């Protein structure tokens, strides 16, 4: 839901 991109 937040910025989950690694």
């Amino acid at each position, epitope marked *: *839901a*937040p*910025d*989950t*991109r*690694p």
Partner: single-chain antibody
Amino acid sequence: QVQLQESGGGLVQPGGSMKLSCVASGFTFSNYWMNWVRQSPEKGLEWVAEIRLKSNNYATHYAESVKGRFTISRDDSKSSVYLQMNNLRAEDTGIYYCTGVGQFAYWGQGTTVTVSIVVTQESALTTSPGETVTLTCRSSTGAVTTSNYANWVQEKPDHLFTGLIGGTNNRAPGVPARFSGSLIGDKAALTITGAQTEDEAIYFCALWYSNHWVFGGGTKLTVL
């Protein structure tokens, strides 16, 4: 080294305006959301604003305290994020940081602005080298879950922030292996397995609630 370099702060009058800038290097800026977070002694850390990608039409969300007054924006061709602050008040005084990435790995050096719901952590803990110490972070809304995406961030002298852990238990790149994230007893936790002298610092947790962040009040860790 990723670098986030901020500018624009100073000594301003109530009712005034001001614009902050942050320029990114060392990572692909355009692929990540960015946030502004501020620190005051009237207890920051306080998350202020976020801006998503060119694919989300640059959507933005603001803390209730700054909405209608602050504007966050980004220029991906200059790898820069900005914060236009209008109708400033005494409450906006503090050190302002741009930060992002999984979800708060990278922090700018901060820029001072002087104008002239509850996340709880341990006030202080005391350990010594070689010991295993655990810091916790509880929410007043009940049990922290992986849907809160807990982050842990470290503050060292003076006002130098480094992200340690995001997404409950994902270590940011280049963070020492002694640092670990968990969920224990309906709280978020950070464990340092073998504390070192240099881990003396202030540790902050942040929890996500649907469309915004709430930061804990911070834990002062002393290492004798």
